[PDB]
Amino acid sequence: ADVQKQIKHMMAFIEQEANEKAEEIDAKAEEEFNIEKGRLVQTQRLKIMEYY
Amino acid sequence: SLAEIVKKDDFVLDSEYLVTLLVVVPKLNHNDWIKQYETLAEMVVPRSSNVLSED
Amino acid sequence: QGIQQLLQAEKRAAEKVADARKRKARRLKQAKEEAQMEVDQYRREREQEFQSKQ
């Protein structure tokens, strides 16, 4: 039973990397997606205030 | 050199998560290595022990 | 066997990388069109400034 025990832990290590390689790129870029959008609202705000 | 013992089925391609290493074990400690090849380190393949060429 | 099945089990994580690009290709654009439809508040500001000008 020791052969299939180590072969079952290999799928656990594939999903353990999936907890980091599918969530860190979706958290760092999405927090940068708000930081790029929040500065984008201030870009057209001074453009709409200068016409006003 | 391994210019004549090469084989495409003897190594694992797409090495992003795997690696194939050419290990040499003596004839007297072959049975001692067969019971220890999977327990040398963590996350070792326990069924990929295949003697390609022997001396 | 084991060698052929481990390449298909890596292929399940290969689509986890394409889904990581799918989560940053739409969210960069679905929020940017929300950052371009925010000018309706600015068109509301130009309409409100045309009231005080009147």
Domain residue ranges of chain B, discontinuous segments joined by +: 1-55
Closest CA to A30 of C35, C15, C18, C26: C26
* Interface mutation vs chain B, best among A3, A6, A14, most B CBs within 10 Å: A6
Cβ proximity of A22 and C16 under 8 Å = yes
Residue reference for tokens 């594939």: A14
Cβ proximity of B53 and B5 under 8 Å = yes
Residue C26 backbone dihedrals phi, psi, to 5 degrees: -80, -40
Cβ proximity of B44 and A6 under 8 Å = yes
B16 token code pair = 């992003």
1-55 in B: which are within 8 Å (CB) of C? 12-14, 16-18, 45, 47-48
Give the experimental resolution in Å.
3.6
Whole-angstrom Cα distance, residue B34 to residue C31?
58
A12 token code pair = 């656990």
A16 token code pair = 């353990």
- Tell me the CB-side half-sphere exposure of residue B44, using CA atoms within 13 A: 13
Q: Is A40 exposed, middle or buried (0-12, 13-18, 19+ CB in 10 A)?
A: middle
Cβ proximity of C7 and B18 under 8 Å = no
Whole-angstrom Cα distance, residue B45 to residue C43?
65
Cβ proximity of A52 and C46 under 8 Å = yes
